[PDB]
């Protein structure tokens, strides 16, 4: 897992391209993804 650098990521088949960073987003235990106003995935729980 690579952080603070632009990468072509794929989490559980969710392909994208971006800078991954650690975050203060307080996901509730049942939630794996977070979405923007535009439906673009805005944060992810790492599955490992």
């Amino acid at each position: 897992l690579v952080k603070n650098k632009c990468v072509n990521f794929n989490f559980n088949g969710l392909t994208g391209t971006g800078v991954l960073t650690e975050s203060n987003k307080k996901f509730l235990p049942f939630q794996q993804f977070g979405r923007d106003i535009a439906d673009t995935t805005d944060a992810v729980r790492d599955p490992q």
Binding site: I37, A38, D39, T40
Partner: protein, 48 residues
């Protein structure tokens, strides 16, 4: 001349009170801000 000067100075004093106490005065400019923000938010929401 002193009456006209005092009436001008007093009326210029009332402008600051009039603007400060009347949120609907600047509303013609705030509507330019609100319409263009609302138009961009509508354009982003349409990606969902």
């Amino acid at each position: 001349q002193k009456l006209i000067a005092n009436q001008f100075n007093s009326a210029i004093g009332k402008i600051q009170d009039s603007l400060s106490s009347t949120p609907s005065a600047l509303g013609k400019l705030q509507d330019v801000v609100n319409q263009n923000a609302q138009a961009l938010n509508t354009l982003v929401k349409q990606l969902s």
